[PDB]
Each structure stands twice: as C-alpha cells, then as structure tokens.
Amino acid sequence: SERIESFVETLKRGGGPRSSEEMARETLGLLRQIITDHRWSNAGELMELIRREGRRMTAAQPSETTVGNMVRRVLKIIREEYGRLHQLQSNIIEAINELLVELEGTMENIAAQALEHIHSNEVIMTIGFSRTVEAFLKEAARKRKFHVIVAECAPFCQGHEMAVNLSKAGIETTVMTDAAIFAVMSRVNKVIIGTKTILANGALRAVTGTHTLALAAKHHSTPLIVCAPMFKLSPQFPNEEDSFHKFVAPEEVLPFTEGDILEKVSVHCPVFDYVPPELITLFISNIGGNAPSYIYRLMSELYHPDDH
Amino acid sequence: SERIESFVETLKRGGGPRSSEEMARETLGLLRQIITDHRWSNAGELMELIRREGRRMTAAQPSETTVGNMVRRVLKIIREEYGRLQLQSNIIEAINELLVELEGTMENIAAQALEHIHSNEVIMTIGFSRTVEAFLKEAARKRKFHVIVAECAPFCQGHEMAVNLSKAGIETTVMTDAAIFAVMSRVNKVIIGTKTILANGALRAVTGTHTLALAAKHHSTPLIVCAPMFKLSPQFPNEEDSFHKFVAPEEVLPFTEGDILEKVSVHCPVFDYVPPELITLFISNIGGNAPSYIYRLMSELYHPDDH
Ligand SMILES: O=C(COc1ccc(Cl)cc1)N[C@H]1CC[C@H](NC(=O)COc2ccc(Cl)cc2)CC1
C-alpha cells in the first residue's frame, strides 16, 4: 500500500533512526514490497517504477544518502539479474535477501580488524559520536590501556554521550572543547573520525568540525583513518553546491533571548562540512582495507552508469 | 715563555680536553700571559701581537672554534678598552671578569629547565654533550618522562651518556641511528647539543644532526639547541670542506678483509650541517633568543675585524 507515503513523510519531518541500517532496513523494506507485488511488465517497467519511486524518495531531505545509495544498488542487482536472465522475481528477491543478510553484519566484521591497528599506550583521538567507531574501539579493550581524546564540538553537540558510553567500560577518556584542538594534536597519534557519507572522488562529508581537524593531521603528519562501512559510497562528485548540508534553526547557536541584537545580525548554522581526499590516509571498510586513491574503482564495483 | 708552542703542538696532535673550559681556560691563560709581559707599544702593537699569535693559533685543526672565538673577544675587549682610554690594569682586570663570567655557564644555562620539560613528555636527543646532560639532570625534581637517545656516529660515543643518565634519572632507551624514523612519529621536544654555531644561524654538530632535524620539520616538533655563549662564530658558511674532520676510515671499515680495500672508497665525516631554517629556539646563557635574532647578538660581542 501507500504506507511509503508515510515513510515519505517520515523522512520529511526528520527524527533520525540513528543511521544504524534502519534507513537501509526500511529502504530494503519498501523496495522489497514494491518489488513484491506491483504492476508487471517484462521490459523494466519495474525498473521504471524504481526510477519513479526512487526520485520521489530522493525528494526527501537531501542528506540521507543511504536511501538513494541502497536504491541504486537495488537497481544494479536488477541490471545484473536481467543480464544473467538473457521467474525473475524469485532471483531478484532472493538476491535482495542476500544483500540484506550481508548488510546484517557490518558493525562486527568492520570491528574485528581492530587489534591490528591500535597498540599499547597510544593516544588515539576522535570527534563526534558514531556507532561504528564506538563498537570498533570497544573490541580493542582486550589490549592495553591507551587514552582517548574526544572533542566536544558541533553544538548542538551529540558528542558526550559517547564519552559516557566509553569511559564507564574502557580507557581513560578526556573531553576537550572544540576550540582547543591545536594545543592538543601536538601530543597525539592515530586520529579516527566516523563518516556521515563519503563521495566519489574520495571525500568525507561529516560532522561540522571534521575540517579544521584534518588540517591539523596533515600539519603534524599523523595518519587519520575514517572507518566507514560499505553502502555509503556515494556517486555524484561534489558538483551540487550548498545543498550539501543541513542548515538548522539558529536557536541552537543563539538563544531567542537578548532582544534587538537579533534584529540586524546574521546567524549561520551548518551541520556538515567538507573533507577533501587530499588528507585521508586509509579507509577501514567492510571487506578490505583499501587506500584513498583506489576508492574510485570500488564504486564501479557496485553501481552502473545510471548514477543520476 | 714559548710553552704556547707546546700548546700549539697540543692542539696539533689532538687529544681533546672535552671542550669543557679547557680550550677557553687555556686560551684565556695564554692570552693572559702574552697580555701580561711582552713587547710594549701604545698603538696596538699588543693588538698586532694578538693578530700574529692569533693567526698562528688558528693555524691549528680548524674545528676548535672556541680558541679563535675567545681570541676575537679578547680583541673586542682591547678595542673597547682603548675606546674608553695604565691600560694593562684595565685590560687584565676586564679579562679576569670575562673569566669569572665564563666560570658559570653550565649552571645558569641549566637553571632554566623546569620552565620547559613537563610531566610525562617523551624528550629525545642524539649524541652526548656535557651541557645537555647537566641541563637534563636539573629536571629530575619534576616528573618521570622518558629519554630516547640515538646511538649514532661511529665511533659511537653515544652511550656513556645513557649510562650517566639512566643510573641517576629517567627511563632512557637506546636506539641505533638507523631507526630515527619509526621513532620520531611518537615524540615531542627534541634537544641537541652544538659543536659550534655559525653567524647565519647554523649548527655545526655531530655527524647525524641532519637527517634528524629534517624529521623535526617533517612532523613539526620543536628542537632546542642548548648552547652557551662564546660559541657564536662569525664567518658565514663560505669556506667549504674544511668545515669538518675527516678521520681514518679504520673506524668505519676494519683493516681486515683484504683486497676489497684495494678498490673501494671510504668516507668518514665527523660533523654535519644544520641550516637555520630548522632550529626553533636557542636556550642560552643570558636570555632565550630565537633563531632569527642571533645576528645582532653576534654584533653585540665582536667588532668588524672578523677574519
Ligand atoms: O598518558 C599520556 C597523556 O595523554 C594525554 C596527554 C594530553 C592530552 Cl590533552 C590528552 C591525553 N601520555 C603518555 C602516553 C604514552 C607515551 N609513551 C610512552 O609512555 C613510551 O612510548 C615510547 C617511548 C620510546 C619509544 Cl622509542 C617509543 C615509544 C608517553 C606519554
């Protein structure tokens, strides 16, 4: 039925399911359902329906790149499925089920490869809460006691919660304000950041302090990993400008109090930022450990030239 | 008497007094004696004698820059002495004052140590110097840091200092010279002692100082070169290849393994060249001056007879 419309409203109003493959489980859900029982013609009328419902879905807040990402991957499974087909619903829904089960284990396998990086007594450093970086760092509690420096930035700040969820289970964290990321980072090694979405050229679109942070990395020459799973490799190299973000209400940065000053003064609030591929020095991923400058072909491994 | 000739032979054969106030106390000695009783004319015949005995003294092994350095400073005290101008009383008295001022370098240059090294801070030095060891020993009434010392420079005279430190102080580890780039990714605050420092701001030091300072201005950690006064040499780096000491290649290849030593060329340099584009502070005997200021400090001491 048209419960997807509710879903089309659900992404419209906001209220995030915290990126935990819930957008992916949902997009797989609705694509499974529209894939299940709909109109049927042989010659990709299903694919045309995927383009229509696709572009209607992408008409949401243009930041949830996972929605269109798994949409396009469903299309590539359709194209290869027909490619071998040269009863298709059985093969398509089965392979989509296999992609679901493969998606069902990202946060474990991307966290197994952790002992091979962090060593004893090694002052790691991140910024901003992320599920994968916390799970990833929790499987390195069967090794020695390092430190963790976490930045408290990007207000409204969703960051501390992580400083709790770590320090009551693990290593000796300290929490620094965002405006002190250059007295620190003279005494550190091995920076990690989680990623909101990563671009085709090799860019990280992340939380609103990622840049200003990576610049310090390629100033003191410390390597920064951006641990990010699959299904977040977005096409469309950074052409569209200023729709790249989320501008939120300036209540979060200035209070509605202090009247009259708020007549003539301009307030800005960006949620994301731009990390170019000239500063990332490894990707830890779900299947391999690929470098920055290789990421290109990995994208060609997944998609098809209908990247629009 | 002509015991200076013995001294002129003493620097000739080698056998260093460590550079620890032997070269300066001696040069002050012989300059005091030649200053004391010699030929006398009013119009700087003493100064001409200082030029003659000076250039004869500088005809030693051209690396002991302290000898000519204190020679030239004696000349500047002569020039200012005549400038204000029984002159022997004033000259020998002021030279005595310069001696007593020279008598306390390694303490006052080591007082200013608590204001730099902090708790839990992995310092790092290459080679061994009296002033860097005394300097680091007065920071043992603060917390337990590490010290990473490189075992460079065959003959590798590096360790004695790791002994003389470890049995009195912090947890030092000793690395070979060929591992100064797996380390120096996990360090801060490098220190090096200086054999002599040039006018432009250069450090002429032990034979691994370069390749180390390059790592400092690659990972951007600051390197202090703690060096007292009297070692500010004029003569910006013009004279080439007399800038060193080439020693016998027995120290790097053994006289054993015959016939290979027919056709193969062995090199052995003792010093190297650190340019002023990489040093990031000087801790000194009177102040704490930066690199790019060092220029006028030299003009504070000498006179344009710098040859
Ligand atoms: O625990 C801390 C303090 O951590 C912070 C300091 C400041 C801030 Cl803002 C946050 C955290 N510092 C330690 C961390 C281990 C290190 N390394 C060692 O203990 C020894 O490591 C070495 C030593 C020598 C070599 Cl060659 C290699 C590693 C010393 C400094």
Side-chain angles (χ1 to χ4, degrees), chain A residues 7 14-17 24 29 40 43-44 54 59-60 62 68 72 82-83 95 105 107 111-112 114 117 119 121 123-126 128-129 135-137 140-141 146-151 154-157 159-160 163 165 167 169-170 173-175 179-184 187-188 190-194 199-200 202-203 206 209 211 213-214 216-217 219-220 223-225 228-229 231-233 235 238 244-245 249-250 254-256 259 267-270 272 274 276-277 279-281 283-284 288-289 291-292 294 297 299 303-305, chain B residues 7 14-17 24 29 40 43-44 54 59-60 62 68 73 82-83 94 104 110-113 116 118 120 122-128 131-132 134-137 139-142 145-150 152-156 158-159 161-163 165-166 168-169 171-174 176 178-193 196-199 201-202 204-205 208-216 218-228 230 234 237 243-244 246 248-249 254-255 258 267 269 271 273 275-276 282 287-288 290-291 293 296 298 302-304:
Chain A
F7 179 75
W40 292 110
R72 292 183 187 93
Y82 178 73
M107 293 181 191
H117 297 290
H119 64 94
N121 199 356
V123 192
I124 209 162
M125 195 262 190
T126 64
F129 166 81
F136 181 85
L137 200 48
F146 39 81
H147 295 67
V148 174
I149 309 296
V150 170
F156 59 90
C157 59
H160 300 291
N165 202 7
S167 173
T173 74
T174 73
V175 175
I181 201 157
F182 205 70
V184 185
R187 263 76 169 168
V188 85
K190 196 78 85 56
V191 179
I192 303 174
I193 300 98
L199 297 174
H211 212 91
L213 177 63
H219 181 272
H220 279 283
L224 62 80
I225 313 163
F231 70 83
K232 206 179 263 72
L233 309 170
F244 179 75
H245 312 80
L254 260 171
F256 197 76
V267 198
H268 295 282
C269 280
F272 294 161
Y274 184 69
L279 308 182
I280 305 172
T281 59
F283 288 162
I284 285 170
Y294 179 68
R297 196 178 75 84
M299 191 178 85
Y303 299 148
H304 177 68
Chain B
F7 179 75
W40 292 110
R73 188 172 293 158
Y82 178 73
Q112 212 262 332
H116 298 289
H118 64 94
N120 199 355
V122 193
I123 210 162
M124 193 263 189
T125 61
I126 183 180
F128 142 122
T131 64
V132 74
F135 181 85
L136 201 47
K137 276 190 179 166
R141 300 166 182 88
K142 202 187 275 68
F145 39 81
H146 295 67
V147 174
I148 309 296
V149 171
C152 187
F155 46 109
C156 55
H159 310 319
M161 79 90 72
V163 177
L165 184 56
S166 196
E171 302 91 326
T172 86
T173 74
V174 175
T176 68
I180 202 157
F181 205 70
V183 186
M184 195 89 195
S185 177
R186 263 77 168 170
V187 84
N188 64 34
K189 198 76 87 56
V190 178
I191 303 175
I192 299 100
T196 182
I197 49 102
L198 295 174
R204 177 176 174 180
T209 301
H210 212 91
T211 206
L212 182 267
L214 197 145
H218 181 272
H219 279 285
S220 67
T221 62
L223 62 80
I224 312 163
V225 278
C226 47
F230 69 83
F243 179 75
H244 311 80
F246 295 149
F255 197 76
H267 295 282
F271 293 164
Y273 184 69
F282 290 162
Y293 180 67
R296 197 176 75 84
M298 191 178 85
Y302 299 148
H303 177 68

